[PDB]
Amino acid sequence: AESTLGAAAAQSGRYFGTAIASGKLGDSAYTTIASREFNMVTAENEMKIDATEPQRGQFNFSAGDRVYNWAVQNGKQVRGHTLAWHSQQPGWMQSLSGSTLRQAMIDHINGVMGHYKGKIAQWDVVNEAFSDDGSGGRRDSNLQRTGNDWIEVAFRTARAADPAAKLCYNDYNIENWTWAKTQGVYNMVRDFKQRGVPIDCVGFQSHFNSGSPYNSNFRTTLQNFAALGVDVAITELDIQGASSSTYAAVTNDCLAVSRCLGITVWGVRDTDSWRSGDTPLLFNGDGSKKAAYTAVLNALNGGSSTPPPSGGGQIKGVGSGRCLDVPNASTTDGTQVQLYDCHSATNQQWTYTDAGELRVYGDKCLDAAGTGNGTKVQIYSCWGGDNQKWRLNSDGSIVGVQSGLCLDAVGGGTANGTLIQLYSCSNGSNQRWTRT
Amino acid sequence: AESTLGAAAAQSGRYFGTAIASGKLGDSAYTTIASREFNMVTAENEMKIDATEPQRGQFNFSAGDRVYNWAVQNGKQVRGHTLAWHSQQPGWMQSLSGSTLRQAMIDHINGVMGHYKGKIAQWDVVNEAFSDDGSGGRRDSNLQRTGNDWIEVAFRTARAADPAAKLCYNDYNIENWTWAKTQGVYNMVRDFKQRGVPIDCVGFQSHFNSGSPYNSNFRTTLQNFAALGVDVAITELDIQGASSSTYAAVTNDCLAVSRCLGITVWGVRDTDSWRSGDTPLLFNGDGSKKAAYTAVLNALNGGSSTPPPSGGGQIKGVGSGRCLDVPNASTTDGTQVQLYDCHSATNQQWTYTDAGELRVYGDKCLDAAGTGNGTKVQIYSCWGGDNQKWRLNSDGSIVGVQSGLCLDAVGGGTANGTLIQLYSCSNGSNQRWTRT
Ligand SMILES: CO[C@H]1[C@H](O)[C@@H](O)[C@@H](O[C@H]2[C@H](O[C@@H]3CO[C@@H](O[C@@H]4CO[C@@H](O)[C@H](O)[C@H]4O)[C@H](O)[C@H]3O)OC[C@@H](O)[C@@H]2O)O[C@@H]1C(=O)O
Ligand SMILES: CO[C@H]1[C@H](O)[C@@H](O)[C@@H](O[C@H]2[C@H](O[C@@H]3CO[C@@H](O[C@@H]4CO[C@@H](O)[C@H](O)[C@H]4O)[C@H](O)[C@H]3O)OC[C@@H](O)[C@@H]2O)O[C@@H]1C(=O)O
Ligand SMILES: CO[C@H]1[C@H](O)[C@@H](O)[C@@H](O[C@H]2[C@H](O[C@@H]3CO[C@@H](O[C@@H]4CO[C@@H](O)[C@H](O)[C@H]4O)[C@H](O)[C@H]3O)OC[C@@H](O)[C@@H]2O)O[C@@H]1C(=O)O
Ligand SMILES: O[C@@H]1[C@@H](O)[C@H](O[C@@H]2CO[C@@H](O[C@@H]3CO[C@@H](O)[C@H](O)[C@H]3O)[C@H](O)[C@H]2O)OC[C@H]1O
Ligand SMILES: O[C@@H]1[C@@H](O)[C@H](O[C@@H]2CO[C@@H](O)[C@H](O)[C@H]2O)OC[C@H]1O
Ligand SMILES: O[C@@H]1[C@@H](O)[C@H](O[C@@H]2CO[C@@H](O)[C@H](O)[C@H]2O)OC[C@H]1O
Ligand SMILES: O[C@@H]1[C@@H](O)[C@H](O)OC[C@H]1O
Ligand SMILES: O[C@@H]1[C@@H](O)[C@H](O)OC[C@H]1O
Question: Domains of chain A, with CATH numbers?
Fold first, then answer.
């Protein structure tokens, strides 16, 4: 299939997953999206240290199993997250250090993997062991202070506890090859492979924002690690601003590296995100697909063989030959758009932004004042509303994110002056458009 | 006085007010802004029919006076809202009809206005009496069915109750001069003035959104009513998306009309708005000034020395004489901007959008990574986060909405290559810019 992320990803032998929060599984809107779109699941917090071993020697898998049960019940595989980490440690562990901490770490790994033995596709055995100071050294934590060999020990312990699981090292800010952190993790994984330390994969969290922006060299980073003899996976993907282009670039980088197993986005809806303020996911608050969703799906399906109209560009309806035109090149908010013979005039030059807007005049946005059929499509000052965002489906249609309705040439008209509206998508030619 | 809205408006003998919610007067974050920025107050709900006369003949002014006193104590006048309206009527009035309802209306007016006699600057005597059906006729309500002369009666009663208060007719969707509703109200006020019906003002709610967009002819409307011999007031202003241009346009419309008494925005922070989802106010939920706030203040203070660049222009540093430049015309997210000899190149053409972004290349935005001093200012895909929105102060400084910090040429550098950072505003020449 090529209508859902999971199925689409499956076409390249890859998976596409998300992070599930057990407390949200009772929300039908949430489960409807999660069950339909993803074939891989990571427990957002339920399989972490504090959640699985609340008191020393006392393991608890109720929260984890709620996530796990839902995943397999809906045909999804599971990534275990996470066994050894400096963050979210229960209180009893935070007060530990030295050999006592080292053995507790080992005991924890054995306890959790044993419970899920043979049920987990991948395990993030160790998470965020490297520093962000910019030196590429080890993060200064209670775990690292027990000895530099703690990571190696964690992996050897894991392989023995469940030899069927892929053992991954997971971390963030290791996507840009030029960053010292990236090279530090590289050198470690390389040392591991050379000495026989058990490690099958490297997880790239991929938490992209203006602080740590995506960079095209992410592909070389993936290639480099792949070349060490380990699989790579994008494990916690989310992009501040949810740029359509950035989301597509990440998708293509993974599909460009044969060893990239798949892509997991850290959440379902922006409102579910640990950083909802960055509206970084593929679905918005009310559960509708965002422009980035379409871009990701299209990339997974191979995309197209016609370079997207970078900056400016007309939109012509295949069923009329007329171009999306703004009546007499007006810049008056509330002006309903129309169909008109194509010509080189700004009032016909539309830019599809990475945020999903169709801009004209540089600061006016294609706007819908309503969500029902017959809603007049117009121009209005750009402010980022969902009624100003659109998805350009590969089938040639342009759907409104908020409405879920398609741009429709009223009454299937085709003569100049034909007004544009929103209407239940119909493969009709009065709803298909071509970039130029 | 010109660092706050009220004080700036006062320079032209006008006021800039807000709608106060009695329940928020206990929130210091709320009152800190409210007491500082406005010199006119309207009770958001405390002076309405159901709130002042819970039972016929039994008036309750506790909540109302609470707001009234807070206002006067903090140096603000008050607009009484509202005496006769089809909405928010107590249960007992909603069932009355004909004469009994007519007398109930008259009594209500005498009761409330009697209590506040001589204390109120303006009274919205009658609210929303016209239909949106396109006919330009009266709205069908129990009040209108008491007889078409109800509006006239309400005003005559009001004049008698308190001859010292300015009596206003208040409505929405009467801003666009071409609308039937508008002409419907225009004709009524003209008639009233000709027949001597006591009416001193017309309140334009000014609730703008894609459904009923702002139109430049709003000024024409204000001037037309003004010519009739009545004052005009912007009573409940809020703009969907809070466009800087629209907010500035409305402010200038009032400044262009001698009879325009002032402007009231319907709320303090976006989170206090009856339409919070449209983030239509001047302050963010965190209390920070939005791009539109500065646009209004600048308008109230007069504006810029020269007509601001309408999209596309250089930004030259006063101290250095050099322009804001994107190194090597790079389009890579995360590229920090610099100062460089000014020249006609796209990597120096910045467009200030209505939303407050500073765009370059069309879909790239001036972006701040963090919120502290030294934070790098760079370019990043446009998505509309507050770290991508800026206020153009009249002193030449450019402030980040989210950080509240100024664009600053590092170390006061003036040479080519000087990097741009965020830093506490200092009025230094390395923090001043000219739109050229
Ligand atoms: C107590 O106040 C805040 C906490 O400061 C804040 O961390 C958060 O804590 C929640 C907890 O949030 C988890 C944190 O982990 C996220 O996933 C990680 C993201 O970074 C990657 O590098 C890691 O690999 C990921 O595992 C996850 O998405 C968040 O949901 O969840 C459990 C809660 O009990 C805890 O309080 O929120 C609290 C707060 O809002 O009160
Ligand atoms: C489902 O219940 C909802 C109501 O539907 C919703 O209106 C709101 O009602 C509150 C009420 O809200 C007031 C309504 O008036 C607003 O101001 C008017 C806006 O329109 C202009 O034309 C008028 O001139 C203005 O006066 C004001 O901003 C809102 O705060 O306040 C009193 C509450 O008792 C009532 O429930 O919210 C309820 C709800 O959420 O339960
Ligand atoms: C065809 O003429 C072109 C030039 O080929 C083109 O380079 C440009 O030249 C401008 C000049 O552009 C500056 C050059 O410096 C850039 O910043 C550099 C960033 O990396 C650092 O290592 C360097 O030291 C920095 O200089 C800056 O971003 C560009 O804007 O600016 C001065 C102009 O007089 C010169 O012509 O543009 C011309 C052109 O189109 O006219
Ligand atoms: O209250 C205001 C003060 O906070 C403000 O302080 C100035 C802040 O900038 C200082 O100069 C910066 C030093 O660091 C460099 O990197 C920057 O480029 C410089 O601009 C300046 O020395 C402080 O005085 O001054 C104005 C007060 O009203
Ligand atoms: O908890 C972790 C955060 O502390 C971490 O923060 C990163 C710090 O460096 C910045 O450049 C990054 O943008 C920022 O995300 O991010 C990962 C998260 O798991
Ligand atoms: O209560 C009033 C609302 O009913 C009114 O609704 C307007 C109806 O026309 C649409 O075009 C507008 O977008 C919509 O806001 O708005 C004013 C409010 O006071
Ligand atoms: O918008 C149309 C314009 O593009 C064309 O040039 O003239 C007719 C107008 O309606
Ligand atoms: O144009 C619309 C057409 O596409 C739809 O199928 O039926 C209603 C028409 O108005």
Answer: 1-300 (3.20.20.80), 313-434 (2.80.10.50)
